[PDB]
């Protein structure tokens, strides 16, 4: 089994909780966002070889959680673009999460779809998301003037 | 005037004539060694502007045999020419050739009209077509 060998069963449970009944969906989102390092873990599970669940479900979960607020959206943008490692992670603890081992800013069709969903959804806070995207573009252009 | 002899024999000529000239030089081998080595060293700078690729095999065989005469100047000039040529070749690369030789590993860029040589199990075949039997 892949469920017994990996940590993907919990993700399937979360996807079922979020998407089974659309009426309660918002409630579930409000209970999930405040957990620490959840977005980083989901993103890490997204960019790995197929281990038991397909990419579209992970994309759906990430989009649904990342749109229930505005701080969460900015955190997700930072995760996808500029830094995807764990938050407050010192290797001196041996118990805190440590999501090293993956390069920053890797592009795949799933990432492009998530970014497009985040950018072009009409809701409060969309202006802040566009501001963050343009700020990243400006920073990338500026850092190119390294000589 | 051995310098001009080599210039008109191994360059600006065909394949059979070059083979015959190499034959004549080999016959004339048996004081001549160092003189012919100097002549070939002087003519090496003019080598890149030759005409046929099959006209250099016997020439390089002769240089390989007579390299025992001297090892200092020949190596220096040879290294200088290698350094000079090396840079120029790199500038002619195009993305398509690199992509072809990386993704599929197919060299000998097929978008250049000009070729220079052919080979078959150690035989040089140029300026002559294949016999259709």
């Amino acid at each position: 089994d892949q469920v017994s060998k990996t940590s993907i069963g919990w993700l399937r449970l979360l996807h079922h909780c979020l998407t089974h009944i659309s009426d309660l969906e918002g409630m579930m989102a409000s209970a999930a966002a405040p957990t620490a390092n959840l977005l980083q873990t989901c993103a890490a599970l997204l960019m790995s070889p197929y281990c038991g669940m397909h990419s579209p479900n992970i994309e759906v979960v990430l989009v649904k959680i990342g749109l229930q607020s505005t701080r969460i959206g900015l955190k997700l943008i930072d995760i996808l673009l500029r830094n995807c490692a764990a938050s407050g992670s010192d290797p001196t603890d041996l118990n805190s999460p440590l999501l090293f081992g993956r390069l920053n800013g890797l592009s795949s069709d799933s990432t492009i779809d998530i970014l497009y969903q985040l950018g072009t959804t009409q809701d409060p806070g969309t202006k802040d998301r566009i501001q963050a995207l343009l700020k990243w573009v400006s920073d990338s252009a500026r850092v190119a003037a390294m000589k | 005037f051995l310098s001009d002899i080599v210039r008109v024999c191994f360059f600006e000529a065909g394949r059979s004539i070059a083979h015959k000239c190499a034959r004549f030089l080999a016959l004339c081998i048996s004081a001549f060694g160092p003189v012919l080595l100097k002549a070939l060293l002087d003519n090496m700078s003019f080598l890149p502007a030759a005409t046929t690729g099959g006209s250099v095999y016997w020439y390089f065989v002769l240089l390989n045999y007579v390299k025992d005469e001297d090892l200092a100047g020949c190596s220096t000039a040879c290294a200088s020419l290698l350094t000079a040529v090396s840079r120029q070749l790199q500038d002619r690369l195009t993305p398509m050739e690199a992509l072809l030789q990386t993704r599929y590993g197919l060299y000998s860029s097929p978008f250049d009209p000009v070729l220079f040589d052919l080979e078959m199990s150690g035989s040089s075949c140029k300026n002559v077509y294949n016999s259709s039997i």
């Binding site: 060998k5 449970l13 309660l24 209970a31 620490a36 873990t41 790995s48 070889p49 | -």
Partner: protein
Amino acid sequence: ILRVLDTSDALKAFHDMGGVQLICNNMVTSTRAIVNTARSMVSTIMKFLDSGPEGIH
């Protein structure tokens, strides 16, 4: 477990008991204690070297 949570009342009760935080915490902790056993760059490069140190042989 999925069959148990097939109804709205069951999901609401599960949320009230705080299970939704439980599963997220479990996912975050369990990802830390597992190494991916799939193949990666190293296997590819070993294949490129053409050799190295029901499908069975």
